[PDB]
Design a protein around this motif. Sequence first.
Motif, PDB file in Angstrom:
ATOM      1  N   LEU A   2      16.477  -1.258   4.020  1.00 46.15           N
ATOM      2  CA  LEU A   2      16.122  -0.011   3.319  1.00 46.15           C
ATOM      3  C   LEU A   2      14.682   0.431   3.494  1.00 46.15           C
ATOM      4  CD1 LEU A   2      17.546   2.022   1.497  1.00 46.15           C
ATOM      5  CD2 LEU A   2      16.383   1.010  -0.481  1.00 46.15           C
ATOM      6  N   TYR A   3      14.520   1.535   4.191  1.00 41.95           N
ATOM      7  CA  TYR A   3      13.176   2.107   4.374  1.00 41.95           C
ATOM      8  C   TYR A   3      12.906   3.266   3.409  1.00 41.95           C
ATOM      9  CZ  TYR A   3      11.767  -0.774   8.326  1.00 41.95           C
ATOM     10  OH  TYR A   3      11.357  -1.826   9.123  1.00 41.95           O
ATOM     11  N   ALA A   4      11.614   3.534   3.371  1.00 44.01           N
ATOM     12  CA  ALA A   4      10.980   4.310   2.311  1.00 44.01           C
ATOM     13  C   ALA A   4      10.262   5.492   2.950  1.00 44.01           C
ATOM     14  CB  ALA A   4      10.047   3.409   1.477  1.00 44.01           C
ATOM     15  N   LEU A   5      10.403   6.841   2.385  1.00 45.39           N
ATOM     16  CA  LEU A   5       9.820   8.075   2.961  1.00 45.39           C
ATOM     17  C   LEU A   5       8.677   8.593   2.085  1.00 45.39           C
ATOM     18  CD1 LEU A   5      13.126   9.917   3.925  1.00 45.39           C
ATOM     19  CD2 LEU A   5      11.464   9.000   5.495  1.00 45.39           C
ATOM     20  N   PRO A   6       7.586   9.060   2.692  1.00 38.24           N
ATOM     21  CA  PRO A   6       6.600   9.479   1.721  1.00 38.24           C
ATOM     22  C   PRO A   6       6.637  10.909   1.314  1.00 38.24           C
ATOM     23  CG  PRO A   6       5.629   9.544   3.954  1.00 38.24           C
ATOM     24  CD  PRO A   6       7.152   9.316   4.082  1.00 38.24           C
ATOM     25  N   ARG A   7       5.705  11.165   0.413  1.00 45.51           N
ATOM     26  CA  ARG A   7       5.526  12.457  -0.255  1.00 45.51           C
ATOM     27  C   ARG A   7       4.911  13.488   0.684  1.00 45.51           C
ATOM     28  NH1 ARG A   7       1.509  14.943  -2.687  1.00 45.51           N
ATOM     29  NH2 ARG A   7       0.034  13.270  -3.229  1.00 45.51           N
ATOM     30  N   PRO A   8       5.281  14.765   0.511  1.00 48.01           N
ATOM     31  CA  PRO A   8       4.611  15.830   1.220  1.00 48.01           C
ATOM     32  C   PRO A   8       3.199  16.026   0.706  1.00 48.01           C
ATOM     33  CG  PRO A   8       6.734  16.550   0.390  1.00 48.01           C
ATOM     34  CD  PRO A   8       6.451  15.243  -0.241  1.00 48.01           C
TER      35      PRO A   8
ATOM     36  N   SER B  39      15.091   5.709   1.215  1.00 47.08           N
ATOM     37  CA  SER B  39      14.682   6.055  -0.157  1.00 47.08           C
ATOM     38  C   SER B  39      13.285   6.614  -0.237  1.00 47.08           C
ATOM     39  CB  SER B  39      14.730   4.843  -1.068  1.00 47.08           C
ATOM     40  OG  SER B  39      15.092   5.228  -2.359  1.00 47.08           O
ATOM     41  N   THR B  49       9.193  14.273   2.957  1.00 47.98           N
ATOM     42  CA  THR B  49       9.039  14.905   4.265  1.00 47.98           C
ATOM     43  C   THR B  49       9.731  14.096   5.337  1.00 47.98           C
ATOM     44  OG1 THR B  49       6.843  15.870   3.781  1.00 47.98           O
ATOM     45  CG2 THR B  49       7.460  15.637   6.098  1.00 47.98           C
TER      46      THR B  49
END
Lengths: 9, 212
Positions: A2-8, B39, B49
């Motif tokens: 499980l990978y994690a996406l960051p904030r704009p 996630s 993004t």
Amino acid sequence: KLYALPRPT
Amino acid sequence: VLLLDVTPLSLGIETMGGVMTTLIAKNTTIPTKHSQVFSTAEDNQSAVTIHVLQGERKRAADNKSLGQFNLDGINPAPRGMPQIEVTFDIDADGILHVSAKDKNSGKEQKITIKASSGLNEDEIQKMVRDAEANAEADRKFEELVQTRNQGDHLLHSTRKQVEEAGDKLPADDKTAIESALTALETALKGEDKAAIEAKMQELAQVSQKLME
């Protein structure tokens, strides 16, 4: 697994 | 067949810490669809993004940026909870479609990428040569990040657990932690994996009463 996406700007 | 269309560089997106996470492997025959679930990096994150990249380097920055879009309307939940399905699909004419869908909210967004985008052959060769040549460093980078992210997390968690308690113990407990949260905060900025783990551990120490 499980990978994690960051904030704009 | 003695010949076929492939996408010549690995394709993926950027994940926490500025690493590339692959999604369609180089030299994959086209057309082709792949999906992966992701996630949110942090707590209470309503938006993500999706930065689409082409290349073979572990630094997202080192690769070719094909584009990007935002996925909003995610319900602020704890980190790791939301289920953001990302899909890369390349049609027969080399057109690349990238979607992201938050499974809870159902919020979806999309971008279309022209077959002609990205890197030319010279550039393709170079990438590959470069990736190979810097393999060790790309590995080092990746782990660096894996550690950095564990720490970032330990960080918010430890901070959440403290400012969660009242009998924050002899406040001398509390104080040792704050003095260890700093050391960590700072260690994190570095490029030295060991130093991060080494502060993570010290922190893990003076947290007995909070871990309980």
